[PDB]
Ligand binder design. Structure first.
Ligand SMILES: *[C@@H]1O[C@H](CO)[C@@H](O[C@@H]2O[C@H](CO)[C@@H](O)[C@H](O)[C@H]2NC(C)=O)[C@H](O)[C@H]1NC(C)=O
Length: 49
């Protein structure tokens, strides 16, 4: 199954830009054992939240 990472838009208002909105990915450290592969853009051209 691997691991899922999701990015989001920052806080926005009509005519205004506000603080960013992210998860706690920066403080997580993963072991690099033999490398990894990344699947990118699998859910393209679809309605998403
Ligand atoms: C990053 O955030 C995730 C999601 O909240 C944290 O995972 C939770 O950690 C708490 C505290 O130990 C546990 O009680 C929950 O069961 C965890 N949830 C899941 C889904 O794993 C995670 O610890 C955070 N990483 C940090 C702070 O380094």
């Amino acid at each position: 199954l691997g691991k899922q990472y999701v990015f989001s838009d920052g806080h926005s208002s009509p005519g205004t830009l506000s603080r960013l909105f992210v998860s706690n990915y920066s403080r997580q450290v993963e072991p690099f054992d033999s490398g990894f592969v990344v699947r990118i853009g699998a859910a393209a051209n679809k309605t998403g939240t």
